[PDB]
């Protein structure tokens, strides 16, 4: 009985309350789920090509503004004139510009050199960036085939190749596939096989931050389990430098003097930044490393401002308050903000007033104001991603970067409040009781204002166990070319010589699960960090360290040509047969298929250790009597495993003796029939 | 409390059920809410304006 319904009533509490707790946490993970940063990515002005090099740039206060590029074939002679109003002339005499955006790898991807020539550098500098951000995460880039992974890349139309009405001489049809912001996300989704929503956003100087905002929305609603968020402004032709001189907004030195009295223009720089975004639960469940956590982000427009280019104050306050409100955080929870800091004499005052309004009005500690453009320059559509890169690197190193050219704080901004502290010196930012939080603001010339809130990664990674083992896990590394293989050995050797003390099994595990299986494979089983570094330097020079190169070309549209003529050396053993699921399934299927007419089993010959079978070895072309049945069984198994292990084949044919062999993998057989 | 055994805790049923209904309705209005087409503006070939 139920004590006159007391059990029934209270038990219905115990389900309704539990369901409410589940549904409200579903509200929380569906509206304010803290999405984490898995890997970092950047090709920023100067020598920056990796996030660690960008931190080396920020920590020592180096400015990337050096000068105009010369690899691009720029005229550079009509680009300037004593008359500031001359058509065809720019005003800034430099700016931080990429020295490697001119070059791209066609052969690495499924791109022809003819195609890659017409590819917009912005897109070329997203294919490589997506690859390298996937590697850095410990996630094999080729393992994300036909998987939900949204792409959000911000760009700037500008102009790169010839007129599309006039076409070209070598490039005719792939000029579309290059000079379109559209395919600047579709390419990445296609080469990497990503099935997630491929959106290429375009919101001027805030495109990257907008893209990360949308990626946050996609993950919070759950449309894509993974998100590809980033932005870029490659600088192919000097036209936009010429015409941003026409309204007299470019700083003649090309430097972003953010919040400085010497701000004589907002300058300009070209760069690229990219992020991996996804919900923290999916991170810590899947084991993906968490660099930082992006809690809340808002996107708004300036409205009817003093023109399309002029910023708005109230709209900026609204966006940087709405980001906090949607993040569940506030002005007092942010220890250091990353403002736009475009560098113009007009945007900076209103921007700092907005910062003082949303944050400075109620501050317990002075807010540390910083600007990545001071060290880099205004990266336009790559601004907002560079800011979050700077803040996440400050998280991971526990130090606030300097804001260059900010010693003389702007006289047009009221700093007497003291709630905002300009980051003219490196301020330590150690982990403490307060969760370290940062904010990135980007205000595009289109008027779209965006702001995001970056909380430190929850320090739950600590607690890892330590042990030792005799397992000499092979250091497997693969590339798309022999020179790429030699360079992948050399860079790994340089990393292990500049970052010593990394345990060999950790290195092997990172090289194995996180580096894709590329069609040029060199591997070795190290015993010591010296014997491993010697092998790495040997592969770098190009000698035979194991005499083993796993060669191939592609995986898509594979036709399974089946030539015989002797292969499939008997070199299997215990555990090996049970490492691959489809491999073992096919071997056991071939085992169980022949009951009535055959009784010999290949598994005892396979699972037998081959360390003792290497002293009487012979070539596979003269042992056809014994090798051929093994050829047939292992050929069935290997065809079945290579059908789906990262390969999307198109058909199967037979070059020689692989005809009935691939007919038996077409079905239409029984026990007796297959045996016969 | 007074007769039977449930006139203070059934109120807890009522409040919890209302809250759960309002939360699931929030779920369906944030992920399944119909979005109305207020008006339509087009410029299309053939003189369509």
């Amino acid at each position: 009985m139920a004590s006159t319904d007391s059990e029934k009533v209270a038990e219905y509490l115990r389900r309704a309350t539990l369901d409410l707790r589940a549904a409200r946490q579903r509200i929380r993970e569906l509206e304010g789920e803290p999405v984490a940063v898995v890997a970092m990515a950047c090709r920023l002005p100067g020598g920056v090509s990796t996030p660690e090099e960008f931190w080396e740039l920020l920590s020592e206060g180096r400015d990337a503004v050096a000068g105009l590029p010369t690899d691009r074939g720029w005229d550079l002679d009509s680009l300037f004139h004593p008359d500031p109003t001359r058509s065809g002339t720019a005003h800034q005499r430099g700016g931080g510009f990429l020295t490697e955006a001119t070059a791209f790898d066609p052969a690495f991807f499924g791109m022809s050199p003819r195609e890659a020539l017409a590819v917009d550098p912005q897109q070329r500098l997203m294919l490589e960036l997506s690859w390298e951000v996937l590697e850095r995460a410990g996630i094999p880039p080729t393992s994300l085939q036909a998987s939900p992974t949204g792409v959000f890349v911000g760009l700037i139309p500008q102009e790169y190749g010839p007129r599309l009405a006039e076409g070209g001489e070598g490039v005719e049809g792939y000029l579309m596939t290059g000079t379109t912001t559209s395919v600047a996300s579709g390419r990445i989704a296609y080469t990497l096989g990503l099935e997630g929503p491929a959106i290429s956003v375009d919101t001027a100087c805030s495109s990257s931050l907008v893209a990360v905002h949308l990626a946050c929305q996609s993950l919070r609603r759950g449309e894509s389990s993974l998100a590809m968020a980033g932005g870029v402004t490659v600088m192919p032709t000097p036209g936009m430098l010429v015409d941003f001189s026409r309204m007299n907004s470019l700083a003649p030195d090309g430097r972003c003097k953010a919040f400085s009295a010497g701000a004589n223009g907002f300058g300009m720089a070209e760069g690229a930044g990219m992020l991996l975004l996804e919900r923290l639960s999916d991170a810590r469940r899947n084991g993906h490393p968490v660099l930082a956590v992006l809690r809340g982000t808002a996107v708004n427009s300036d409205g009817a401002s003093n023109g399309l280019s002029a910023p708005n104050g109230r709209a900026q306050v609204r966006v940087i308050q709405q980001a906090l409100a949607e993040s569940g955080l506030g002005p007092a929870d942010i220890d250091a903000v990353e403002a736009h800091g475009t560098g113009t004499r007009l945007g900076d005052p209103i921007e700092a007033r907005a910062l003082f309004e949303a944050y400075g009005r109620d501050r317990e500690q002075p807010l540390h104001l910083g600007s990545v453009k001071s060290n880099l320059g205004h990266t336009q559509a790559a601004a907002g991603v560079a800011g979050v890169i700077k803040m996440v690197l400050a998280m991971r190193a526990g130090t606030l970067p300097r804001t260059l050219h900010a010693s003389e704080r702007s006289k047009e901004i009221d700093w007497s409040s003291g709630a905002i502290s300009l980051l003219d010196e490196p301020e330590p930012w150690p982990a403490g009781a307060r969760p370290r939080r940062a904010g990135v603001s980007s205000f595009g010339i289109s008027g779209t204002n965006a702001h995001a809130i970056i909380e430190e990664a929850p320090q739950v990674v600590e607690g890892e166990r330590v042990e030792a083992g005799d397992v000499v896990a092979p250091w497997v590394l693969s590339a798309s070319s022999a020179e790429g293989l030699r360079a992948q050995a050399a860079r790994l050797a340089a990393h292990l010589r500049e970052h010593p003390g990394q345990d060999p099994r950790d290195i092997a595990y990172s090289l194995a699960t996180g580096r894709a299986a590329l069609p040029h494979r060199a591997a070795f089983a190290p015993v010591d960090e010296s014997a491993a570094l010697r092998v790495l330097d040997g592969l770098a020079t190009g000698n035979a360290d194991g005499a083993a190169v796993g060669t191939s070309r592609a995986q898509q549209r594979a036709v399974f040509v089946f030539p015989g003529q002797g292969w499939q050396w008997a070199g299997m053993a215990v555990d090996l047969l049970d490492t691959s699921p489809v491999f073992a399934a096919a071997l056991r299927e071939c085992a169980d298929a022949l009951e009535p007419h055959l009784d010999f089993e290949v598994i005892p010959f396979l699972r037998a250790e081959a360390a003792r079978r290497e002293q009487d070895a012979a070539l596979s072309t003269e042992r056809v009597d014994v090798v051929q049945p093994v050829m047939f069984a292992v050929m069935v198994s290997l065809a079945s495993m290579w059908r789906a292990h990262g390969v999307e084949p198109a058909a199967v044919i037979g070059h020689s003796q692989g005809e009935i062999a691939a007919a038996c993998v077409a079905g239409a057989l029984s026990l007796d029939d297959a045996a016969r | 409390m007074a007769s039977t055994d449930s006139e203070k805790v059934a109120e807890y049923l009522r409040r919890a059920t209302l809250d759960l209904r309002a939360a699931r309705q929030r779920i369906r209005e944030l992920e399944g809410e119909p979005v109305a087409v207020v008006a339509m503006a087009c410029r299309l070939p053939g003189g369509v304006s």
Epitope: A2, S3, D5, E7, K8, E11, Y12, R14 | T4, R14
Partner: antibody
Framework: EVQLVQSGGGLVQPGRSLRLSCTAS????????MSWVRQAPGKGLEWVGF??????????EYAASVKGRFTISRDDSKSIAYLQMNSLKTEDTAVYYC?????????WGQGTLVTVSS | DVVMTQSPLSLPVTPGEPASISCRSS???????????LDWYLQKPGQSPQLLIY???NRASGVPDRFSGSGSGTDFTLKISRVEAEDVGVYYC??????????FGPGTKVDIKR
């Protein structure tokens, strides 16, 4: 999360005892009242009995067909539920379920084959 | 006396169509608290069942919101908006006004319409 995983399946003949244990993890065990249901093979479930929570205290109900045969006990420190078979007969040949509530069987374990065959 | 509860049995459902299962009660299951005391369960063929609806209309968590239900003081209706390939099994219209609950009802083994 939650799991009321069971254990104690086996093959017995009528007239002896059998063990059924329900592992509780992911929640406070003394808050929910354990119940046990039996599923005859190929046809509908037919309930067995339940025990009330310690804070409530209460008593134990069993089905009219298991009076004086089956008993249920519970504990918080080890958080394992107990369904006891004594003097088994043929009708007990069925898969039993561990249910998470006296009247709301809001969670259900996988089920263990309790077979009493001759 | 014991409440006589017999849902209409044998409701085949084919994927992509709206179905609806009713249920019977001898006397009213609507208590003085204004709430119904009948529960809705679906028996997996092959493993454990799960909860669809309690209070007669209040749905449980975990299961999708497709399992909608309502009812009058006596008449009840687990009114299932649609079914799919996995929505096949045995639905139990169990009451909760009179402990013991005992059997879960003969049960509504439901299948694919054809």
């Amino acid at each position: 999360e939650v799991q009321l995983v069971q254990s104690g399946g086996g093959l017995v003949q009528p007239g002896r005892s059998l063990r059924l244990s329900c592992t509780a993890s992911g929640f406070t065990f003394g808050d929910y009242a354990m119940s046990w249901v039996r599923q005859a093979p190929g046809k509908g479930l037919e309930w067995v009995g339940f025990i009330r929570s310690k804070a409530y205290g209460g008593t134990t109900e069993y089905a009219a067909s298991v009076k004086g045969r089956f008993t249920i006990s519970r504990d918080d420190s080890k958080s394992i539920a107990y369904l006891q078979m004594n003097s088994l007969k043929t009708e007990d040949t069925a898969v039993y379920y561990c249910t998470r509530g006296g009247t709301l069987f809001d969670y259900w374990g996988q089920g263990t084959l309790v077979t009493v065959s001759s | 006396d014991v409440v006589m509860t017999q849902s209409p049995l044998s409701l085949p459902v084919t994927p992509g169509e709206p179905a609806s299962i009713s249920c019977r009660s001898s006397q009213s299951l609507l208590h003085s608290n204004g709430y119904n005391y009948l529960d809705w369960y679906l028996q997996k063929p092959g493993q454990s069942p799960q909860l669809l609806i309690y209070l007669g209309s209040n749905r449980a968590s975990g299961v999708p919101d497709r399992f909608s239900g309502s009812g009058s003081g006596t008449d009840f209706t687990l009114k299932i908006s649609r079914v799919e390939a996995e929505d096949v099994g045995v639905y139990y219209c169990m009451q909760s006004l009179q402990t013991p609950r005992l059997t879960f009802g003969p049960g509504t083994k439901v299948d694919i319409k054809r």
